[PDB]
Design a protein around this ligand. Structure first.
Ligand SMILES: Nc1ccn([C@@H]2O[C@H](COP(=O)(O)OP(=O)(O)OP(=O)(O)O)[C@@H](O)[C@H]2O)c(=O)n1
Ligand SMILES: Nc1ccn([C@@H]2O[C@H](COP(=O)(O)OP(=O)(O)OP(=O)(O)O)[C@@H](O)[C@H]2O)c(=O)n1
Ligand SMILES: O=C(O)C(=O)c1cn(-c2ccc(O)c(O)c2)c2ccc(-c3cccc(O)c3)cc12
Ligand SMILES: [Ca+2]
Ligand SMILES: [Ca+2]
Lengths: 212, 229
């Protein structure tokens, strides 16, 4: 019940907000609950946990977890970069905005022109492959996927795993979901409480660290 | 005493979210707490309160208050149209989005490879102003007080009071609550631009204090207006 002792774990959770001006922004409907649950379970099993949190459903800080609060995707990126060097597990559970307004208004206010934000998960994946994160043992991504006219849900999920290159892709089929490993393993994630699904996610992380 | 006994009160609170697709939206940073505080105080003082709530999911429903939930500024508009005939006082405390994306995608907008397009905006209707016009056209015979809220700063073209007076005159509501702001917490600056501006010219200061104390002063302001009539 304490296998993650000595693990430094960095978790992102919640959705980011891309400011239009001091008051208005682009946001999403993500609750952050599953990222917090992974943070709580990680800490419960002995990890030294840092939680980078964007916008959440009123969530209370998990006890024993270092909280770092952020607003935008770019602030998330800098937060991930700042806390990256000593971490052994990166759990990218945040819904990071792909786009942000190019211009932020100085005062209270046409169209909003967009510019792309950095892909932090892929930045972490690339940094580790070029030797800049030797302590990083597990990079975990999240995806909310669905079947559509261009493929079924699981096709899209596999393609996302292949494209991101992370060690584990936790897939939420928008009732059951999936855990896709980079060695090809696929486990169904049965629908239950946020805590029990977090246990299955952390169990998979612990299983990956031992194989390596 | 219980001065708002027999008053039917319709309160809007929180910010709206204007969908870009099922997941993304345009939103603002309004907590909705000052609007809940006015409703709870109204209810505590004997009003029959109906609360139309925007983005306030982690807030607790005020005791004794009929809850109506909405998402976008447009759904707020339709909720106000439905519930306005039962109200004697309209308290427009919601942070209504001024603009809405022109097209709502049926699916999550994927991050592709070509240049990201732009978000076309379209103005939302002024719900408070729609209410002021309805009362003027005879469609709201029960409506006794129309209350608006505004966050006003002082920019290059006037101080808070200039912009606020212009807003009250322009909106046509009976009372304009200006800069009912802050939770009075440590290290939060007080700029003393709090005001209750009536459509008869009276200007009273709104001191910055707790959400409950500003709610009490606002309802006090409402009750004084109902007595004048
Ligand atoms: N700018 C971004 C966006 C994504 N994420 C992370 O990347 C993972 C994949 O998220 P997803 O949105 O599904 O990937 P996308 O490439 O953005 O997929 P799509 O374009 O279909 O939305 C998540 O763990 C998320 O936290 C990230 O680190 N940086
Ligand atoms: N589309 C809108 C705009 C605002 N409101 C209401 O009207 C009041 C005015 O808010 P404010 O944003 O300050 O007024 P605006 O006309 O939008 O002024 P501005 O463009 O400077 O923001 C508030 O009570 C708000 O709930 C509304 O009913 N519908
Ligand atoms: O932590 C949360 O709950 C949360 O807010 C989430 C935000 N994303 C997310 C990521 C990238 C996106 O592009 C996007 O749109 C959303 C999630 C993706 C999957 C899960 C998940 C995983 C297993 C079981 C399960 O039930 C939910 C949770 C979230
Ligand atoms: Ca995305
Ligand atoms: Ca406005």
């Amino acid at each position: 019940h304490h296998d993650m002792a000595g693990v430094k774990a960095l978790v992102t959770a919640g959705g980011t907000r891309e400011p239009l001006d001091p008051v208005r922004f682009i946001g999403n409907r993500s609750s952050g609950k599953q990222g917090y649950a992974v943070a709580r379970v990680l800490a419960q099993r002995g990890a030294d946990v840092t939680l980078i949190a964007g916008n959440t459903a009123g969530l209370i800080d998990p006890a024993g977890v270092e909280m770092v609060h952020i607003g935008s995707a770019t602030q998330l990126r800098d937060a991930v970069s700042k806390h990256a060097p000593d971490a052994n597990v990166l759990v990218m559970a945040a819904a990071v905005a792909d786009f942000r307004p190019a211009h932020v208004a100085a005062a209270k206010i046409s169209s909003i022109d967009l510019v792309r934000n950095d892909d932090v998960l892929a930045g972490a994946v690339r940094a580790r492959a070029d030797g800049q994160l030797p302590n990083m043992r597990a990079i975990v991504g999240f995806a909310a996927e669905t079947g559509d006219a261009n493929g079924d849900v699981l096709f899209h999920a596999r393609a996302k795993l292949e494209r991101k290159g992370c060690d584990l892709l936790v897939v939420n089929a928008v009732n059951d979901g999936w855990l896709l490993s980079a060695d090809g393993t696929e486990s169904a994630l049965e629908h239950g409480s946020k805590t029990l699904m977090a246990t299955r996610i952390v169990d998979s992380i612990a299983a990956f660290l031992k194989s390596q």
